[PDB]
Chains A and B, each alone.
Chain A
Amino acid sequence: HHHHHMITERELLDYIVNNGGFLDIEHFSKVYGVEKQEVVKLLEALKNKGLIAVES
């Protein structure tokens, strides 16, 4: 699959909302080509801005 693709926090948040508040980091990294640690990094920034409440 694809590697080192970059997305914005807004794109990830929009994806999450559109995906019913669900994110499979493995699947997402595979399909959209974003590194797993980059997805984690973006989630942390969303969490620290109080924009998302992470579960499971």
Chain B
Amino acid sequence: IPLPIPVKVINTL
């Protein structure tokens, strides 16, 4: 089980 890397994702639409 990897430690999830946090990612802020914008402008997806």
Residues in chain A within 8 A of chain B (CB atoms): 13, 16-17, 21-27, 36, 40, 43, 49-56
Q: A interface, by DSSP: helix, strand, loop or mixed?
A: mixed
How many residues on chain B are close to A (CB under 8 Å)?
11
Assembled-state Cα–Cα distance A26/B12 (Å): 7
Contacts of B7 in A (CB 8 A): 16, 21-23, 43, 52-55
Identify which of A13, A17, A40, A51 contacts B12 (C-beta below 8 A). Answer: A40
Assembled-state Cα–Cα distance A21/B10 (Å): 11
> For residue A22, which residue of chain B has the nearest CB?
B8
Q: Are B8 and A17 in contact (CB under 8 A)?
A: no
Identify which of A26, A49, A50, A52 contacts B11 (C-beta below 8 A). Answer: A26
